[PDB]
Symmetry: C4
Subunit: 388 residues, 4 copies
Amino acid sequence: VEYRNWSKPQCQITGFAPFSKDNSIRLSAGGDIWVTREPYVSCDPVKCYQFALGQGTTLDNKHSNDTVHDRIPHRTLLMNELGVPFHLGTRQVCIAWSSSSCHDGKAWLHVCITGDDKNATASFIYDGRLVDSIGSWSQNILRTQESECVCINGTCTVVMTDGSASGRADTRILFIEEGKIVHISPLAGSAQHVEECSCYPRYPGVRCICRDNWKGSNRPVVDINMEDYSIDSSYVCSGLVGDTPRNDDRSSNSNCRDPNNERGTQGVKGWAFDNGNDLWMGRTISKDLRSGYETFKVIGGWSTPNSKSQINRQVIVDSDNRSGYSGIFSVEGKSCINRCFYVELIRGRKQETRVWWTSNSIVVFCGTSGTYGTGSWPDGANINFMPI
Amino acid sequence: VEYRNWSKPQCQITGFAPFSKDNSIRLSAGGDIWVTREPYVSCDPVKCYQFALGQGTTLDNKHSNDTVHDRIPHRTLLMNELGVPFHLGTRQVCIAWSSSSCHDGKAWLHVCITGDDKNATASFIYDGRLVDSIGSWSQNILRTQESECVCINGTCTVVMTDGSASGRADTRILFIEEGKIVHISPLAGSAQHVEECSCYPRYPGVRCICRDNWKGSNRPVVDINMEDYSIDSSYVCSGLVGDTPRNDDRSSNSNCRDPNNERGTQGVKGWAFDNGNDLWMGRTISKDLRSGYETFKVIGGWSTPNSKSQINRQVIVDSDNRSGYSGIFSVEGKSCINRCFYVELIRGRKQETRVWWTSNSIVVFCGTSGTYGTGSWPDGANINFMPI
Amino acid sequence: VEYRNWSKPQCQITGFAPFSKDNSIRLSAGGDIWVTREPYVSCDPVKCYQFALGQGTTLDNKHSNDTVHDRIPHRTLLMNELGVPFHLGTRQVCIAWSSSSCHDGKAWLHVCITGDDKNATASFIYDGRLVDSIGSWSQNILRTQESECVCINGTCTVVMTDGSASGRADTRILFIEEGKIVHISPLAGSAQHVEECSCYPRYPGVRCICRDNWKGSNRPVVDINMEDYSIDSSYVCSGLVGDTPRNDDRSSNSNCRDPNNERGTQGVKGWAFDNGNDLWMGRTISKDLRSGYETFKVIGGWSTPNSKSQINRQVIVDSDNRSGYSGIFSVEGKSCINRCFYVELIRGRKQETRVWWTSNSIVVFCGTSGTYGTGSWPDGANINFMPI
Amino acid sequence: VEYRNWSKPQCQITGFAPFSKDNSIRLSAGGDIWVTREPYVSCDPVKCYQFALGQGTTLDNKHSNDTVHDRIPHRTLLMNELGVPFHLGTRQVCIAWSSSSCHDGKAWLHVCITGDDKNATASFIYDGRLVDSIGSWSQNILRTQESECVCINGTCTVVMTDGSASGRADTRILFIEEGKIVHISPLAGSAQHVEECSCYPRYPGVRCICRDNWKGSNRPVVDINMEDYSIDSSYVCSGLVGDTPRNDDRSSNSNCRDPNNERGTQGVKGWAFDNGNDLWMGRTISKDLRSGYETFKVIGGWSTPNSKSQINRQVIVDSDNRSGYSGIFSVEGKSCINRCFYVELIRGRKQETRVWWTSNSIVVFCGTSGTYGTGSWPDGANINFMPI
Ligand SMILES: *[C@@H]1O[C@H](CO[C@H]2O[C@H](CO)[C@@H](O)[C@H](O)[C@@H]2O)[C@@H](O[C@@H]2O[C@H](CO)[C@@H](O[C@@H]3O[C@H](CO)[C@@H](O)[C@H](O[C@H]4O[C@H](CO)[C@@H](O)[C@H](O)[C@@H]4O[C@H]4O[C@H](CO)[C@@H](O)[C@H](O)[C@@H]4O)[C@@H]3O)[C@H](O)[C@H]2NC(C)=O)[C@H](O)[C@H]1NC(C)=O
Ligand SMILES: *[C@@H]1O[C@H](CO[C@H]2O[C@H](CO)[C@@H](O)[C@H](O)[C@@H]2O)[C@@H](O[C@@H]2O[C@H](CO)[C@@H](O[C@@H]3O[C@H](CO)[C@@H](O)[C@H](O[C@H]4O[C@H](CO)[C@@H](O)[C@H](O)[C@@H]4O[C@H]4O[C@H](CO)[C@@H](O)[C@H](O)[C@@H]4O)[C@@H]3O)[C@H](O)[C@H]2NC(C)=O)[C@H](O)[C@H]1NC(C)=O
Ligand SMILES: *[C@@H]1O[C@H](CO[C@H]2O[C@H](CO)[C@@H](O)[C@H](O)[C@@H]2O)[C@@H](O[C@@H]2O[C@H](CO)[C@@H](O[C@@H]3O[C@H](CO)[C@@H](O)[C@H](O[C@H]4O[C@H](CO)[C@@H](O)[C@H](O)[C@@H]4O[C@H]4O[C@H](CO)[C@@H](O)[C@H](O)[C@@H]4O)[C@@H]3O)[C@H](O)[C@H]2NC(C)=O)[C@H](O)[C@H]1NC(C)=O
Ligand SMILES: *[C@@H]1O[C@H](CO[C@H]2O[C@H](CO)[C@@H](O)[C@H](O)[C@@H]2O)[C@@H](O[C@@H]2O[C@H](CO)[C@@H](O[C@@H]3O[C@H](CO)[C@@H](O)[C@H](O[C@H]4O[C@H](CO)[C@@H](O)[C@H](O)[C@@H]4O[C@H]4O[C@H](CO)[C@@H](O)[C@H](O)[C@@H]4O)[C@@H]3O)[C@H](O)[C@H]2NC(C)=O)[C@H](O)[C@H]1NC(C)=O
Ligand SMILES: *[C@@H]1O[C@H](CO)[C@@H](O[C@@H]2O[C@H](CO)[C@@H](O)[C@H](O)[C@H]2NC(C)=O)[C@H](O)[C@H]1NC(C)=O
Ligand SMILES: *[C@@H]1O[C@H](CO)[C@@H](O[C@@H]2O[C@H](CO)[C@@H](O)[C@H](O)[C@H]2NC(C)=O)[C@H](O)[C@H]1NC(C)=O
Ligand SMILES: *[C@@H]1O[C@H](CO)[C@@H](O[C@@H]2O[C@H](CO)[C@@H](O)[C@H](O)[C@H]2NC(C)=O)[C@H](O)[C@H]1NC(C)=O
Ligand SMILES: *[C@@H]1O[C@H](CO)[C@@H](O[C@@H]2O[C@H](CO)[C@@H](O)[C@H](O)[C@H]2NC(C)=O)[C@H](O)[C@H]1NC(C)=O
Ligand SMILES: CC(=O)Nc1ccc(C(=O)O)cc1NC(=O)CO
Ligand SMILES: CC(=O)Nc1ccc(C(=O)O)cc1NC(=O)CO
Ligand SMILES: CC(=O)Nc1ccc(C(=O)O)cc1NC(=O)CO
Ligand SMILES: CC(=O)Nc1ccc(C(=O)O)cc1NC(=O)CO
Ligand SMILES: [Ca+2]
Ligand SMILES: [Ca+2]
Ligand SMILES: [Ca+2]
Ligand SMILES: [Ca+2]
């Protein structure tokens, strides 16, 4: 085998077509299915798998009550082939309440994180074995992407943070090269608060549209140069803007340079990608809550400040139901590296209160230069038939 | 590996012998088994798998109530090795309420279809990755075979339709060549309404005995020439005729040229194949309802109008119980390409009303030049022990 | 790969050591486990698997009531790796109420039998695909071994019968050579009623200690010469004698030539093997019922009429609980072909009546030249905790 | 493939980072999970698996009542990939109430033990097939490690005992070389009662920190020279001392030469390893009960009598909950052979009495030269939500 060096032009996509869905919640009312959160999908050259931080339990387990909590010593990273639900036969690849896996092209790398918020650790399991580790620097919930890291020629770069939800955090980018961290670079550029990045190969570099829990609705962008370990950062030019909550199309702004300070203290993991001066992106159809999810093309959104010229939209999840976290994921084509996204459909506590558990099912569309109709693929679980 | 080029003489079969059965419904009253419909089986050179459009749920899930509906955003294409039921560990290969998979001889192709009836899309997932897509042309339930497409030297041909259940539809045949649609040809020949075809390799071409929901009981035939992308069509010569409902042996007819207009607005996916001037075929033992299923050889049925000279019959499913959809499937032998069929044994709503769910189990016999007894292999599930 | 030609001296065993056990019944009261019967184990060069004719249902399924019946259209041949129970994820390799599988050394052969007792068929699935078939000759429950057939250089020989439980049957031996039956030879020798043979390689031939439901307690022996397709037959010389029911050690006899007519109309699948003039063998500890199971070495038992000189006995299953069918199975060693056996531990109806189901779990010891203690490994399921 | 010859310098570890956890008990209240005990993990060059002696049942099976008993004919050795719970789809690799598996570098070896305490046997299944066996020598619960044996160049050494819990036992070390026992050597050195050893490669030899149920809290050490089949033994120099029960840090002692006779009649499987004159080790945080588990580095602990100079400690399992057995396990790195440990988290009868079952879940950290925070990863199962 050789390493993934991703040297192929990004495909010229026309929009998004359907790819996977697992009905996990639907099945949960009639099968021993896990109770996960903050999911994502990644693929090795031959096939894809779906990741998710389970709650160390099943929906029918009374151990589901209080599944809202974000970090318990029992959150383990599950890993199935893309399309097969998290049934008792699922492998818990490692202990972690926050993660990121990528496949250098020879084996898998799994940034797994557990422990006290104040003082947590991060295990770097590569090729099944624990190659290195690192500990909490700012002694405050050392976290990472909750999406897949990316590798180019042997080095895989994961951007992690440790600092303060709504406040100045110490974000840095590790260059774990085959399990062992070969270098660490503090965040450069303008960005004011990088959280849970959605990264993707941009030969010869890596680009990340992230989050910003501090004071921006417009998405942060963290560019890592693979050549010299450098870093740069900014924000998306898009005027539409995509985080949640956010202001609203008419009254939202961004200048690619600073946090817009428009309902900013807030967030949800999102994604996006350039293409010429344009920006393929997607956000919740709702601007206050995580309901529904749309995607569209903002002509100019990449290179021109506050552009609100939208186009090619699509309802992935109708507005009348829940959405959630969202990341990106690439797949090498025979001629070009395609772009794909997934959607976390969360159900349970806080929003819906009939139940005492909080799990989620996924949905994944993929770039396509072909044609396509219209639809809305929600979770589908009747909360009234659900356990608890 | 090389591609399947199917250049082998079709075996000279004597009848049909037993091959698989999964008791899915039987097991459903005592196990987390899925709730599928419109099943089929296909095989790559080494082994076979069984497909089925599940209802994004299990029989015990209250989410089973109303499983009668044909298309919900939750229907995903399941895929197991031939013989292992759709238990929670089954992979949902893609989102689709209508499909067709084939294996060019190097990897699998999966025509998956979801979305609004009015405007649906069709994803062409090949080798795990989404290679292309196409959208609804007549803006009316873009559908396909619900059986396996066939490939010769690299090009795989699936015939799809989009138009009007009982009325003129726009049927066309795509030539997806390794995920990407390399050509599309509108239906030629006489045929008046091709629906859910059962196709099979007929080196150097592909032949399809399909359905006809408009005005025929006799089965349509769609021949695709692989050489020039052409098309031709007609109807089976058989006087016995095999759709449902249909008239009845004595009073049924066909002339290989036009819809017989004998209870025609009606249908069920069926299959058949030539052999000299003869026609191996199978239909429900009942001519009004889908109960039971028989097979036999009509001497002349292929090349001579309205032939009712039957022979070599066999009861696969006794008349006293349910049958359903049915397709064909080929398997390369060491010297000849064998012919095989499967039977959808449906249970649940509308017909049986004790329950509120509608699932099905399969049965599959395969051509054989050997000897064989007689039997009847139904579903076997006691509807009185069944959930709901 | 090459074929198994078994040219190695049989190991010089000292007795039997433990190998597998699946606790299937025990697990059945707390898991979706199948309801099988007439089990057996076989191995391909690399590993072993365990076979069993399930009842097309689980113990918790109400579909378990009446699982006593021997042949229903729903009995399918299950196949797991040696040691993993028949859980919903088990593959139903084919439809069959009587079978025999062997592995020529390149792929598997599965003699599967279903259909009407009067007129049943026998599918010969080889390398996943149906290669041939044969139909019922004496129009009376065409059956076979319920153990593994054996192959030498490409030809695999299964001995089947069709005739009359307690009466003259037409037993014959097929020489299915890679799926296709290359020859059939009627039973020769003295034997008066061969039923469900336990066969084993005896380079360059195959030997079978079978059953005799007609008028013998002493076991039949069917030798097949691979060289010329011939056959020969007789009975074991052993005076101890091992079928059930049988007379009793003191008053039991045999002369290697004729049925002893000592409680003969009766049977249970058993096994045994030579070694010089001696005979390794095993029978139920009880001589009327199937309770318990023992093994021992009869010095002379092979070559000398009515020898009752026993030695090296062992209680595999203590007398206070159920046993059942039993077959043999070989395994190639690095220097010699080892001999192994398995024991069907049946539970359920007729004998135990608290329940309405009849399933079984297995136990398997294997030859050993080493040392070993003593024990008793029964089923272990508390019938009072069991479903129904 | 080649054999594992382990010729690499042991890594220079800084402490322990998280690796796996299976939440088995947590899942048991909502899934068909097995009821095991005395677990362990081992890895072949490519990946790891987790072993455990199940109780031939599930927690929901009424067959769980009385799962406290240590040896029943139904205890079978389960084997899953590291991270996937013991769900019905788990393979019972053999019959055994005491075991040890290792992988010579070409295939697996499984020392499985069952039978009467008085007269038990030990099957040596290698490469799937039973290669040899041995019987009970002192006719008293022939037992072994309950951890993984180790192999160097083709010979795998397991140290077994048979004798008297609290009294002089006959411990010996077998040198099973590819299934067949090529030599046996009685225990040499000073050690007074070796029980369930935790062994590890120390090129060109093997070292074992074991137990001592007789009259020591300080751990026994059994060194096996691979070169000449010799043996040597002693006790750890550490003054901290790690068994349970034990005296207490201030008042505990050891001189590397004799049993300390400090609460000695007692035990629990533990582990430890040298590093220069130092000793990496771990024990329960409690000195009377098995609650909690800690690890630390005793500077000098290896080469200097009664050293109590501790350092680098860590709470793996907080003191407020249960721990249990513990073994070691090695993993070859790209440059050095890393050291790892696992912790048996037991739940059920005797200690906790709300329930009638006694199962356990595991936790596994692995050596690391990196950094790491602090945490406590217990079982997590709310005994009040648990079955029975
Ligand atoms: C491909 O296919 C699309 C499908 O797009 C998406 O449509 C779904 C529904 O919106 C969405 O959830 C799914 O995920 C698809 O991706 C084709 O067009 C689209 O489909 C429908 C119908 O054309 C549009 O749906 C809207 O939402 C309501 C529910 O479906 C519907 O009621 C809305 O219509 C109201 O306005 C119409 C005129 O537009 C009017 O006739 C009615 O009055 C109607 O009723 C409301 O209005 C009144 C009060 O305000 C009262 O009558 C009554 O109380 C009621 O509340 C609306 O139609 C969807 O927006 C539409 N267009 C698009 C661009 O998606 C599309 O043909 C094709 N396009 C592409 C690019 O492939
Ligand atoms: C191989 O084996 C076949 C098996 O073929 C199929 O038979 C099953 C039953 O029909 C079918 O479900 C299964 O799937 C097999 O594939 C051998 O022959 C066949 O088997 C039976 C018996 O010979 C035939 O079955 C028919 O269906 C009824 C249920 O089994 C049965 O009652 C029918 O018989 C009535 O007529 C007979 C004479 O034919 C007469 O003796 C009785 O009176 C009987 O009773 C009814 O009639 C009266 C009122 O009308 C009253 O007595 C009473 O009220 C009752 O209702 C009939 O026998 C099946 O048709 C038959 N033939 C064939 C060609 O399949 C076959 O030997 C062999 N063939 C081949 C090609 O391999
Ligand atoms: C290896 O290990 C064997 C184990 O062999 C098998 O023993 C188990 C029990 O029989 C069997 O189920 C398991 O599968 C093993 O494979 C060692 O020896 C064997 O073990 C026991 C004890 O030595 C023998 O068991 C017999 O069965 C009864 C239950 O265990 C037991 O009660 C019987 O003993 C009666 O007789 C003894 C003297 O023999 C006497 O002291 C008592 O009185 C006892 O009690 C009954 O008798 C009276 C009324 O008749 C009353 O006292 C009271 O009411 C009660 O009913 C008997 O001991 C087993 O037979 C024995 N021998 C053998 C050769 O297996 C063996 O050491 C070693 N051998 C080898 C070849 O490896
Ligand atoms: C990396 O991160 C460690 C984490 O180490 C371990 O800490 C967990 C809790 O002990 C453990 O279960 C987990 O597995 C970790 O591996 C960082 O430091 C450690 O964390 C905490 C806080 O610093 C320490 O925990 C102790 O245990 C109690 C529960 O957490 C806590 O209440 C204890 O504190 C009592 O003393 C403090 C001063 O120490 C005082 O402020 C309070 O009064 C407090 O309250 C009790 O005392 C009074 C009565 O006696 C009353 O106030 C009241 O009734 C109450 O009972 C204590 O803090 C843990 O020991 C600590 N240190 C270490 C070295 O682990 C560490 O920063 C970093 N280290 C490394 C090497 O990476
Ligand atoms: C990126 O990876 C590809 C695959 O390793 C490299 O291209 C291959 O190697 C040589 C030199 O380019 C050619 O003969 C092959 O035909 C190439 N493979 C294919 C599929 O075209 C490529 O050089 C790598 N490096 C860069 C910088 O792109
Ligand atoms: C159809 O496929 C077969 C397999 O690729 C082709 O035949 C093989 O290739 C060469 C030329 O025919 C022969 O030496 C081999 O012996 C053939 N294989 C076998 C199993 O016979 C065949 O040419 C393909 N093309 C056509 C048009 O049939
Ligand atoms: C039985 O099978 C074995 C394996 O195919 C044959 O022996 C091998 O082939 C040649 C000729 O004997 C030797 O160089 C190899 O060393 C043999 N293999 C082994 C493992 O010894 C053997 O000839 C076959 N035929 C017969 C009649 O025994
Ligand atoms: C231990 O095992 C290794 C692997 O088999 C042996 O080293 C390899 O073999 C030759 C001779 O040493 C070298 O060319 C290879 O480069 C070695 N492999 C690696 C990865 O370095 C080694 O000799 C074995 N024996 C001993 C005593 O260490
Ligand atoms: C470790 C962890 O709590 N991850 C999260 C997951 C979801 C959410 C969320 O609110 O959906 C938040 C966090 N935490 C943060 O991002 C804090 O800035
Ligand atoms: C997509 C879809 O509804 N497929 C079907 C499946 C079964 C049936 C059926 O009636 O069994 C019908 C359809 N639809 C049509 O064929 C309409 O002409
Ligand atoms: C097909 C079938 O019934 N197999 C059997 C299995 C078990 C038994 C049994 O009685 O255990 C009997 C049979 N049948 C016969 O052997 C009749 O001679
Ligand atoms: C075979 C067996 O009983 N193994 C054990 C497991 C656990 C324990 C235990 O007490 O945790 C004890 C034993 N037995 C012994 O070690 C006797 O010295
Ligand atoms: Ca924000
Ligand atoms: Ca019609
Ligand atoms: Ca008899
Ligand atoms: Ca002790």
